[PDB]
Design a protein around this nucleic acid. Structure first.
Lengths: 159, 51, 185, 148, 222, 58, 50
RNA sequence: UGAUAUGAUGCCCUGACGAGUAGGCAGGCGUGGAGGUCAGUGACGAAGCCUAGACCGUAAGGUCGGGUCGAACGGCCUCUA
RNA sequence: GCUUUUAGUGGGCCAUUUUUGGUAAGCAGAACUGGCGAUGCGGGAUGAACCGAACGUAGAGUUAAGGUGCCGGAAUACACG
RNA sequence: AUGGUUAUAUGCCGCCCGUCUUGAAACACGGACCAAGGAGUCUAACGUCUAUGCGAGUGUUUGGGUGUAAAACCCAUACGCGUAAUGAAAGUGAACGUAGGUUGGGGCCUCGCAAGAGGUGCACAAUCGACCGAUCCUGAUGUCUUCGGAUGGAUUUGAGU
């Protein structure tokens, strides 16, 4: 018969990342999670209490409830033709902050500073991001760099 | 009521773009370029006709 | 051969004429289609949309709801406009002097409003008094207080008043409703 | 009328709005409430929770005249004074001339205190009063006289 | 109320000042285009003389023509083709070249043919197949006031203002391009030049980057 | 009388007919399931700062 | 046979109910005949109340 | 919506779109009978029937001519099956 | 953005790619997408699914896939083998 | 004469419909032909929606009065549903407050040429509270000393205010 337990199909997921087994380091227990923090869920295999389901491994949500040895994380789940909001009480060994919000909050301090510096100096701030723009025209010199002529190679076996 | 084409129908070509009247004056699309007598470097020709 | 991004030939989904054949109501739509088109006042585009509404979508406004609306700051002298029916409220014992414009008044609401020296005018006397909607206050009644919207969205753990004829013990109060009989919603 | 009916619109089209595969049959799922615990269970829970089972104790020969006690809130209670005397009694809000309100003859068994009578002293002839209905009636300067 | 010429002469005079502004600005545009092309030619020649290689600037703008019909399209290129406003066969748009659009073009490559349009192709496209999105309702351009009343917030007030905000890709390329209704091009008059359309332009078909030869497509499809 | 067992065919085309929907986040989300010792006090934090702000309009 | 959010109805029509349907068409007729009976009784009982 | 000429469910401008089973909805065509109306048609020929004869409508259908026939029947506004 | 209400449906099948059992099967069963069912048109002579392209009634022009000895519209074209 | 209709000739195309089915022109079923008849109806109780009358009320038509007589017209008292809920029940029973605070919110108001700023914010949506019933805890003044249940609560609960 079929088997669809709570930890089915998780041979390699809750595995403990070769030659980094054993107890976990103490900066996992010293992070400070505030209500609204954006977290990533990566289930520690060695802490069997408070683990998430295998759907939520690698899923990113926000913290809604902060208690003694765990936090409450809000995850959206794709089910049917809608999304539901899921609440997960997971211990802090299976969690870490996102660095993609560290892209944001550091760029907020940069964007707010460049607006103030342009306000005192010559507004037209121009503080949006821009995509990778195409390359400009340039002059490449052949001095010391005379082009070597490369031809296609004949076929050889070499076994 | 009807879309008159520009690039024929010279009146509608003149309604849009009032520069076109003088673009046929100085002719501006059969203008000659100024002749400049610069020659390429030798190394450009050596890498062009190289084997 | 066009890759359509939306449903073709879709209607707007809103009412453009009232479903009624009330000839005096269609004369009120004939008056306010003119005024919404040729005054650019945001008021008249609202009253025209409200004149289309169905009887569910215009709940009755109590006369005590009106007297609460004139207790707003600066609204003591505004003309309160009710697109629908003004009903009497015996639970209020002091009513102010204000003017009310409405589609219908009940015989108790009109008797109360003129008792305090106010005037019960119609929606066309309003449009002669205030074509651009000067000094007005549109009041709407409670839409989600009907009996039918109790049963909307009925399901487990939602608490939405099951459709049932007789009410009390032994009519849907058992297995499925308390933990002592199987499960509880 | 049958003139305005969608059976006049399925003339010409074969299955009369019932489908080719479905083939509208006599009783495909039972008759009436048949199979509420077996094949109609997902409808019984979800829209009718609590249907099956027993709650409470039986009352052999229950008469619903013993339990006749219609309620009247402090919201109205002045509708039981006529309108020609209502404005007369609202003004001169004082004792020694206070309106006796016969709530039983008005058709109520119990007075309840939902809210905010005016500060006129009234005389309430009731059978049953709540706490807060009596407190608000007495805070206006009136009493309640229990009758039968 | 006079109004015979007390306002009519004023309207004629205001249209004359608008038309003088359009005339001098088109002269400025033409001089800028000519100096731009001469300067690229001289940078090429003065790199060849100096013993060097002037690489050109990368092209900032492509023109894309939807080459494949409606049926049998996977959801990701179909969604991208809905986003590039190419909802029917032989329809075209101008696309600003950044990485965020290069990857869209690489996604819908087996269904479109694109390339780098010249000034003359853009000019003939807006002059013959140029339509605007004005409360949407697909209004033909046909007069400079039609462009001015919808794009004067960005400075654009003529048809060469439109072309200049296309070719030189401007600070207001997005609004000027989203104003233009997608070009309902015809089939090519000379044919496609290939027996089989649906392989790459490198393999002798039609789709993909057809770079400067996109003009040879579009001037027959326009 | 054997038959097909399971297929996920057409289920994504079905789910995108009505265009799979986001859960419509709100300002002031629900405090349901939030830690009761925090939630008990937050009643008094809000009530006290309403008393203190209505005191500014005495 | 049980499908929608509809209230559970109790229509007691599983017997042979169609053999015992009494439509009262003679409401007007019995009203007239009853008034005629009262008039005839008031005639027979000529000085007395009904 | 400004009258002194008639459709404001109107008239007019503009743009885009149009496959379709099961199925939904909308606008209509036709039949038996009922209320109102056209002071309607009719033994100088009603209804019916026949007609590679004509007209209108995308269509359901409607109208007219000719023949046959002999006593009743239609248009419109609604009701009903 | 939101809500109510209700129909039909709950036998499916094929194609590219991944893939299981089987010697295999126009075999049995999965995954993703696209189709057929529900769909006409041009091509593959012929064919539910392939290629091209999706359809109101028409006119002109241009093509797609496929073709141009004759049936058959269109080179008994040109070029190297 | 153009044109329309019609028969015929010619070029190209066109497989019997209806049905069940993944698939029917099928070597699947019904159909020789014609005329007439022939199949989602009515009732009791209901769901949503809409229209209408009235509106904290509503419903004349069981019955009575009347009548040009199964029509129409008029009417008392009841009763049904609604205006109170919650508990198995005994029972108890909906304002601390501008009927609350915050976040949006059409419309209105003030300033302005406008862009905009501020005030007020009906409905509606999110939230935190307050009130009523049930469950659990607390048990004040009092007492036929075991009744009474004030006051204060609680990740509880309700088809409520």
């Amino acid at each position: 018969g079929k088997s669809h337990g709570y930890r089915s199909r998780t041979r390699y997921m809750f595995q403990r990342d070769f030659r980094k087994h054993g107890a976990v380091h103490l900066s996992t227990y010293l992070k400070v999670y505030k209500v609204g923090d954006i977290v990533d869920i990566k289930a520690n295999g060695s802490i069997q209490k408070g683990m998430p389901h295998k759907f939520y491994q690698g899923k990113t949500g926000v913290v809604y409830n902060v208690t003694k040895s765990s936090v409450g994380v809000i995850i959206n789940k794709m089910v049917g033709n809608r999304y539901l909001e899921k609440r997960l009480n997971l211990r802090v060994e299976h969690i870490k902050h996102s660095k993609c919000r560290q892209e944001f909050l550091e760029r907020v301090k940069a964007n707010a500073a460049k607006r103030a510096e342009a306000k005192a100096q010559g507004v037209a701030v121009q503080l949006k991001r821009q995509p990778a723009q195409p390359r400009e025209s340039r002059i490449v010199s052949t001095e010391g760099n005379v082009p070597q002529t490369l031809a296609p190679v004949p076929y050889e076996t070499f076994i | 009521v009807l879309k008159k084409n520009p690039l024929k129908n010279k009146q509608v070509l003149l309604r849009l773009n009032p520069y076109a009247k003088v673009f046929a004056a100085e002719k501006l699309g059969s203008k000659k370029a100024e002749k400049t007598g610069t020659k390429p470097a030798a190394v450009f020709t050596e890498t062009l006709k190289h084997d | 051969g066009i890759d359509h991004t939306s449903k073709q030939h879709k209607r707007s989904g809103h009412r453009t004429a009232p479903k009624s054949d009330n000839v005096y109501l269609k004369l009120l739509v004939k008056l306010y289609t003119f005024l919404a088109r040729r005054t650019d006042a945001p008021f008249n585009k609202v009253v025209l949309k409200a004149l289309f509404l169905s009887k569910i979508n215009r709940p009755p406004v109590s006369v005590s709801r009106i007297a609460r609306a004139l207790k707003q700051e600066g609204a003591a002298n505004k003309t309160v406009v009710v697109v629908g029916t003004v009903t009497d409220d015996a639970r209020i014992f002091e009513f102010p002097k204000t003017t009310v414009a409405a589609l219908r008044f009940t015989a108790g609401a009109r008797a109360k409003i003129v008792k305090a020296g106010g005037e019960c005018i119609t929606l066309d006397q309003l449009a002669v008094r205030a074509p651009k909607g000067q000094n007005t206050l549109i009041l709407r009644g409670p839409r989600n207080s009907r009996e039918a919207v109790r049963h909307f969205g009925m399901g487990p753990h939602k608490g939405k008043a099951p459709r049932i004829l007789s009410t009390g013990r032994k009519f849907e109060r058992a297995r499925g409703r308390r933990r002592s009989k199987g499960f509880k919603v | 009328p049958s003139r305005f009916t969608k059976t006049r619109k399925h003339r010409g089209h074969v299955s009369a709005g019932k489908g080719r595969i479905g083939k509208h049959r006599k009783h495909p799922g039972g008759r009436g409430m048949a199979g509420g615990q077996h094949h109609h269970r997902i409808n019984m829970d979800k829209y009718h929770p609590g249907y099956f089972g027993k709650v409470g104790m039986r009352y052999f020969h229950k008469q619903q005249a013993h339990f006749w006690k219609p309620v009247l809130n402090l919201d109205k209670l002045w509708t039981l004074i006529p309108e020609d005397k209502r404005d007369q009694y609202l003004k001169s809000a004082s004792k020694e001339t206070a309106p006796v309100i016969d709530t039983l003859a008005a058709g109520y068994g119990k007075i309840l205190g939902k809210g905010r009578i005016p500060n006129v002293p009234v005389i309430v002839k009731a059978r049953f009063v709540s706490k807060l209905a009596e407190e608000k009636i007495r805070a206006a300067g009136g009493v309640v006289e229990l009758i039968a | 109320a006079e109004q015979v010429a007390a306002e009519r002469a004023a309207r004629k005079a205001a249209n004359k000042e608008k038309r003088a502004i359009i005339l001098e600005r088109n002269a400025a545009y033409q001089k800028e285009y000519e100096t731009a092309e001469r300067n690229i030619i001289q940078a090429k020649r003065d790199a060849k003389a100096a013993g060097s290689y002037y690489v050109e600037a990368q092209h900032k703008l492509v023109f894309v023509v939807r080459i494949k019909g409606i049926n049998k399209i996977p959801p990701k290129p179909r969604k991208v083709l809905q986003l590039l406003r190419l909802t029917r066969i032989n329809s075209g748009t101008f696309v600003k070249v950044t990485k965020a659009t290069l990857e869209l073009l690489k996604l819908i490559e087996p269904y479109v043919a694109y390339g780098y349009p010249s000034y003359s192709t853009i000019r003939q496209l807006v002059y013959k197949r140029g339509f605007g999105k004005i409360n949407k309702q697909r209004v033909p351009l046909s007069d400079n006031a039609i462009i001015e009343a919808n794009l004067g917030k960005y400075g654009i007030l003529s048809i060469d203002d439109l072309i200049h905000e296309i070719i030189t890709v401007g600070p207001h390329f997005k609004q000027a391009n989203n104003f233009l209704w997608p070009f309902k091009l015809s089939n090519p008059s000379g044919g496609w030049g290939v027996p089989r359309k649906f392989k790459h332009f490198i393999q002798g078909g039609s789709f993909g980057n057809r770079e400067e030869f996109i003009n040879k497509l579009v001037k027959s499809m326009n | 009388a054997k038959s097909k067992n399971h297929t996920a065919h057409n289920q994504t085309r079905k789910a995108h007919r009505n265009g799979i929907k986001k859960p419509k986040t709100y300002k002031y989300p629900s405090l349901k399931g939030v830690d009761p010792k925090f939630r008990r006090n937050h009643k008094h934090a809000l009530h006290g700062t309403a008393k203190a702000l209505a005191a500014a309009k005495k | 046979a049980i499908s929608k959010n509809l209230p559970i109805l109790k229509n007691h029509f599983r017997k042979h109910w169609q053999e015992r349907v009494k439509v009262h068409f003679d409401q007007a007729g019995k009203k007239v005949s009853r008034r005629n009976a009262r008039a005839t009784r008031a005639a027979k009982i000529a000085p007395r109340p009904l």
